[PDB]
Amino acid sequence: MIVSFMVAMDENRVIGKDNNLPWRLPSELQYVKKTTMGHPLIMGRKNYEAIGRPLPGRRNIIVTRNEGYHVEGCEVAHSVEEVFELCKNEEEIFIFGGAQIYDLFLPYVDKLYITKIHHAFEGDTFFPEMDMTNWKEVFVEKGLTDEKNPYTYYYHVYEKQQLVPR
Ligand SMILES: COc1cc(Cc2cnc(N)nc2N)cc(/C=C/C(=O)N2N=Cc3ccccc3[C@@H]2C(C)C)c1OC
Ligand SMILES: [Ca+2]
Numbered sequence: 001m002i003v004s005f006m007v008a009m010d011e012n013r014v015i016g017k018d019n020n021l022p023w024r025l026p027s028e029l030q031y032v033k034k035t036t037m038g039h040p041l042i043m044g045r046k047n048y049e050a051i052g053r054p055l056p057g058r059r060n061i062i063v064t065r066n067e068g069y070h071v072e073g074c075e076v077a078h079s080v081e082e083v084f085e086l087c088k089n090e091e092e093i094f095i096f097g098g099a100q101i102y103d104l105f106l107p108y109v110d111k112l113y114i115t116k117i118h119h120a121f122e123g124d125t126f127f128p129e130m131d132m133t134n135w136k137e138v139f140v141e142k143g144l145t146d147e148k149n150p151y152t153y154y155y156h157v158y159e160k161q162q163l164v165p166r
């Protein structure tokens, strides 16, 4: 199973301001929708609640310690192992965020879809630092910038840097 991080962040790795997107880039979201069509979306409860609704055309799986937590049109998992069990036949899952959620899935991640927005917003949560030397870029693309998507941004995808034996 391919464990993938899906993330949008600013020049300082900001991913949230008071559980909200500091930016409004509809085209970026259309990218997320396109890229994740037909795969599980893995998210923390806070992230989910900030989104506000089941996002369709895909298994929304919310991750929380809270055993009583339920929401209609979604699944709830209480641990990483619970997520893997739920997704056992899945070919690729997308960790959708909550800084802590990315941390939980960090030792299993195979693939990074990162949108970098060229700006400094005001934020309170951050995409955790990562050593990118174990990572190799395989695709890049300048996102659409216009009246509705004010900022300049780029889609990046990374896979594992393969080591060459001594
Ligand atoms: C903090 O708040 C948020 C956080 C994230 C997480 C995220 C965003 N972008 C990227 N590249 N990676 C992420 N992990 C999304 C969102 C937005 C999700 C959102 O509203 N959508 N995302 C995809 C989607 C799929 C099916 C139906 C509808 C949708 C919509 C849009 C396509 C219309 C968000 O909104 C509040
Ligand atoms: Ca792996």
Ligand SMILES: [Cl-]
Pocket: 043, 044, 045, 046, 047, 048, 097, 098, 099, 101
């Ligand atoms: Cl979260």
